[PDB]
Symmetry: C3
Subunit: 53 residues, 3 copies
């Protein structure tokens, strides 16, 4: 599964790690993250993220 | 996947659209919506919804 | 699917029942519960739960 980066602040979503404190378990692909989740560091939505190719 | 209607207000849950602002992604069948979700328009629970046949 | 017990208070998570009022639908295995869920009775996190063998 691919990493995604927050293009506003640089946070990297790593699917192996998830974002458990916000209910995103390890192993969650970015597309499957609920669409109301926000960047943990900066608070922006998923639409400011981009895949890391 | 089937549409569901809120029998209190008439809102239609369309699985192709989801309810992303409340964390329900496009492609979520109604049964899989977390059971604490409420109608976005009127605030009632899932138990007031019915399948659109 | 296995039951899990809250080792702090004794609450039993039964996957057939879920915890619907907190968005955990019936049929959710414990591992798949979002990692920010807490014991409904006592408020502690998943890390204080143990499988019932
Ligand atoms: Fe960010
Ligand atoms: Fe409604
Ligand atoms: Fe407990």
């Amino acid at each position: 599964m691919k990493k995604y980066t927050c293009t506003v602040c640089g946070y990297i979503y790593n699917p192996e790690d998830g974002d458990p404190d916000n209910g995103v378990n390890p192993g969650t692909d970015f597309k499957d993250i609920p669409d109301d989740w926000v960047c943990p560091l900066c608070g922006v939505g998923k639409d400011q993220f981009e895949e890391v190719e």
